[PDB]
Amino acid sequence: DHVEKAMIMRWGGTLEDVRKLSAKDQLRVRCFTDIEKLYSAYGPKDTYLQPPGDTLPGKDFYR
Amino acid sequence: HFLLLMFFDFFYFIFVFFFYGVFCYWFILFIFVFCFCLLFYVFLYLLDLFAAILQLFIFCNMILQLIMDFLLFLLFV
Amino acid sequence: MLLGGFVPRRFSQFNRDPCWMFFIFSVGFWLGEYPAMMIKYNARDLVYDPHRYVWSHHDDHH
Amino acid sequence: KAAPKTLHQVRNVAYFFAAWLGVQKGYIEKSANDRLWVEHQRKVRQQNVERQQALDSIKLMQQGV
Amino acid sequence: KAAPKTLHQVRNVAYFFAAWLGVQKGYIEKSANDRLWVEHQRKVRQQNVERQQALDSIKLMQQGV
Amino acid sequence: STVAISVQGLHYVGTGLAAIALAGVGLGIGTIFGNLLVACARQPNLTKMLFNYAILGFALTEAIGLFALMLAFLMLFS
Amino acid sequence: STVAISVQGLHYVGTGLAAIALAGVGLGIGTIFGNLLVACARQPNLTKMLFNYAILGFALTEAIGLFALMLAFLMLFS
Amino acid sequence: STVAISVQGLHYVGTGLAAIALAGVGLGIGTIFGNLLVACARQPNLTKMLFNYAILGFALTEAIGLFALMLAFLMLFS
Amino acid sequence: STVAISVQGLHYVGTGLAAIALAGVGLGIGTIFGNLLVACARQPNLTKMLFNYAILGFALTEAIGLFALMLAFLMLFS
Amino acid sequence: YNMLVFRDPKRRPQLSEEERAKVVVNQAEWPEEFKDFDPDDPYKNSPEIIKGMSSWNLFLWGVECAFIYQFYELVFPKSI
Amino acid sequence: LCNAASKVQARSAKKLAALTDAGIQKTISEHNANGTDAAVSSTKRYLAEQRQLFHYRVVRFFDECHYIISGEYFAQYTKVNLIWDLRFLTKLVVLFLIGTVLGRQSIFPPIDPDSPLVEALVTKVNPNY
Amino acid sequence: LCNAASKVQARSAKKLAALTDAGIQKTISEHNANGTDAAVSSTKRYLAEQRQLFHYRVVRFFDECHYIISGEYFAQYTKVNLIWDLRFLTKLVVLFLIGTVLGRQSIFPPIDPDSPLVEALVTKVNPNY
Numbered sequence A: 001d002h003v004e005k006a007m008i009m010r011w012g013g014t015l016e017d018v019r020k021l022s023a024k025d026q027l028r029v030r031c032f033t034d035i036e037k038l039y040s041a042y043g044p045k046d047t048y049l050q051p052p053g054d055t056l057p058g059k060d061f062y063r
Numbered sequence B: 001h002f003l004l005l006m007f008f009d010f011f012y013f014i015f016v017f018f019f020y021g022v023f024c025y026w027f028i029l030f031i032f033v034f035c036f037c038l039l040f041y042v043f044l045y046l047l048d049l050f051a052a053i054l055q056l057f058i059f060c061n062m063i064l065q066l067i068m069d070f071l072l073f074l075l076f077v
Numbered sequence C: 001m002l003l004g005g006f007v008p009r010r011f012s013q014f015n016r017d018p019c020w021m022f023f024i025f026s027v028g029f030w031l032g033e034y035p036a037m038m039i040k041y042n043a044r045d046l047v048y049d050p051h052r053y054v055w056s057h058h059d060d061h062h
Numbered sequence D, E: 001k002a003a004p005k006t007l008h009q010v011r012n013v014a015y016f017f018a019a020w021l022g023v024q025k026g027y028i029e030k031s032a033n034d035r036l037w038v039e040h041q042r043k044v045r046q047q048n049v050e051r052q053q054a055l056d057s058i059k060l061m062q063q064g065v
Numbered sequence F, G, H, I: 001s002t003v004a005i006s007v008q009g010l011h012y013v014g015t016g017l018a019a020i021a022l023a024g025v026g027l028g029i030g031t032i033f034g035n036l037l038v039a040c041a042r043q044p045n046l047t048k049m050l051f052n053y054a055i056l057g058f059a060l061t062e063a064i065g066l067f068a069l070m071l072a073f074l075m076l077f078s
Numbered sequence J: 001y002n003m004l005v006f007r008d009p010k011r012r013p014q015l016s017e018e019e020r021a022k023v024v025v026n027q028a029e030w031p032e033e034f035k036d037f038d039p040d041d042p043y044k045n046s047p048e049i050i051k052g053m054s055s056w057n058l059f060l061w062g063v064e065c066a067f068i069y070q071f072y073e074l075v076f077p078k079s080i
Numbered sequence K, L: 001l002c003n004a005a006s007k008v009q010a011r012s013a014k015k016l017a018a019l020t021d022a023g024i025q026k027t028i029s030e031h032n033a034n035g036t037d038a039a040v041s042s043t044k045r046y047l048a049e050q051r052q053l054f055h056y057r058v059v060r061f062f063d064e065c066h067y068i069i070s071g072e073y074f075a076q077y078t079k080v081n082l083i084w085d086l087r088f089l090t091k092l093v094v095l096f097l098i099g100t101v102l103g104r105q106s107i108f109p110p111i112d113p114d115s116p117l118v119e120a121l122v123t124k125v126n127p128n129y
Ligand SMILES: CCCCCCCCCCCCCCCCCC(=O)OC[C@H](COP(=O)([O-])OCC(O)COP(=O)([O-])OC[C@@H](COC(=O)CCCCCCCCCCCCCCCCC)OC(=O)CCCCCCCCCCCCCCCCC)OC(=O)CCCCCCCCCCCCCCCCC
Pocket: C010, C011, C012, C027, C031, C032, C035, J053, J054, J055, J056, J057, J059, J060, J063, L047
């Protein structure tokens, strides 16, 4: 449930948007979620905190 | 259980993302940390096993004490 | 109560009893899942999600 | 117990030690390169932030409040 | 010559064959991805050429000969 | 005027205060063991009862130590 | 009005407060060894057994210090 | 509104709090030696043996203070 | 918004906290001498020997207080 | 001996030294499984449950199961 | 540095003397008298035997293939054979997965150019890796 | 598909019968009579011997170290020992190079960000590799 929620929220916010991706992309996303789970409170905080100047999409990307 | 979950998370993190140090020149530090983690794992499990049973001893002892506080014994003659 | 039962003297004897055979199989699974995680989650081709900053549990629970 | 006619065990240990030393050299090189790249990425992000701030300042001047 | 009580050799051959088949699957996947990337790079170069030609045409019009 | 303020770093302060409770726990353990040695010196034969009671109490003091540690983690990871 | 503030220097305070928990551990160890010396003079024939029990108590106290130190480094870095 | 603040002088408070842990260590050492003097007057023949254990407690008691002292430098110089 | 602040006066607070460590050190020294008097009245023939150990304990206990005092000077003069 | 927290039970002696010394040991009557019996390793000669199945083989089987559990999706991923 | 080496040597000597294998002890004594290495000799003997048994392996493989194909193997099928076959299947599956990983030379499938994950490749911290 | 298999089996049988090793033939006959595999048994015997000879290897290593350190090895030094030492040095060098390659996980040294070759990394045809 958590994995599916992350996939939905990070890639459009709708199930169809996630299904628009390929199986390999979904595998990549789920393995990144597993990475986050393993990191938890001792891993680097750049996995969820966007450093200033980063070119990657922000929280308002789909808004 | 909170403490157990936190310690297990730390153990998973260090074991997964820092085992390669075995092959590096700082392998001794990782070995020391791993032995420490194993010792702590064993200690935590033993402590929890003993405390789980002790807390039931005390949960039942409180009720028995309540009962005993109002019991009166007669002497046979 | 840990009173008795078959107790293998060393690793080689774990095959002398079905229950301990299952136990050593389970131990193998337990200990071998860690190297698999090391290989899988430290792979060169592993890439962080580009949209990882779009959403996170930290903002959700906050 | 006569003297050993061969030194196979010492040679095997030396082989292991040499391979290990090579591994350490490669690991040190890779770690140094990774640190250099991390610093480079940090500098790139800082430069991008400075450029964005300059653009925002120019836009503010155009606003003329 | 009694019947074989074990099938070790057949199992070893099957292990080799399974590993080989997996290798073939991975090689096919990698080759397909490489071909896709080659086509993508070719398209990118073609688009760059078209953009350069358009820019040159606009510059020619500005020249007005 | 109505003003709502949300300070982030305060959760660190509460975490440290809870850890102070361990000061009264670690010391409490030392007190039990301190008495244990004296008791064993004047009743060597009855070491079994004394050692068991020392470890029973050490768990009833460690519980309180775990009480605080849970709050520390709650205020540190949330 | 809604105001969100993030103070970057508050983890130092939390770390220091957690470090205070070691005062109990240090005193607890001192109590253990103080009793050990008294017990040894009382019944010197049992020095080894008392020494082992004192070490056991010391290890338990040190573990509590590690718990307190665990909350210190986490706050200091995190 | 989002506000990020960075206070530079807060590490002094953290350093001072960490130093407070030394009070427990100092008190623990005093207790160890106080018991040592009492114990020696009771069993003078074993004075040397008691002294070694007292030093052992100091070695195991001063070490805790170093960890608290270490945190002071990690924050004082950062 | 990013705001960086540098407070001068905080160093006084950290310095005062370090002084509190002396409370334990001062008490710890008193404990040693308190036992010394009891030990001397219990075996006066060893008064000289006991006095030597008490001085040793005072030197070790005093050393801890200096560590805290050093931090006070570092923050008080910085 | 011990295997983690599992300790091997030991039979208490019942015969006195005087009676014990008069006992004549004849291992010829003993079963083949228990000859040269050693309390520290009573199951050294015990037969295997499955012939040719070593403990290391089962350990490797478990490791392979773990590897499959972790890597199957990497080769046969499925859509949500 | 020297005391530790002496202690390790002493422990190994004690363990070596402890074993009660007549053949192992005899070989050790013979090699010590001759000054040669027993382990290396054992390795060479094993390699020679394997070199001489290659065609024996081939013949056994063909015989086993005939035994299986003839249906005689399944005639006497038992639970033990089922356990062995399950072990065999597990090894086949894990070997297939490992072979795929090695074949594509990457733990994860490669990203296609049209995939939205290409950005991740572009934003690598260290392009060399 | 079948004739080729029969021909291969016949060739292997001829070669197996050709060898004139008494021990090999005896073992083959015994295993054929018992229906077991000789090669697998040899492998298990070798592994058991190696497992039982580990501490023997340790003792031999320490003895060889003492022999070398004592200077007795160089007292009787000959040309054959020189040849062996040259072989040993070559193996050490190649192992060191291989270890370095594996340690950095790349045949070539990684490119620094300030190097002008970074463009090559940017212009990779397949970023995944
Ligand atoms: C006393 C403890 C009791 C347990 C208590 C309960 C649990 C407590 C928790 C801790 C448990 C620890 C783990 C259990 C012990 C495992 C090791 C062991 O004892 O082995 C016995 C066993 C001998 O006992 P045996 O019963 O006489 O076995 C009969 C023969 O072995 C023959 O075996 P067979 O008859 O079954 O035949 C199998 C078959 C087949 O045998 C094999 O397959 C051989 C193994 C090949 C590698 C496969 C993977 C192995 C597993 C690794 C991952 C495990 C991770 C978990 C480890 C946990 C450690 C904490 O044999 C062969 O064909 C021979 C192999 C010939 C080829 C040689 C070349 C191999 C190349 C491999 C390439 C792959 C490399 C990877 C990269 C590839 C990239 C493309 O020794 C081995 O075979 C070990 C070899 C490998 C050693 C490293 C394994 C990982 C690390 C283990 C550390 C253990 C520390 C223990 C300390 C104890 C202090 C008191």
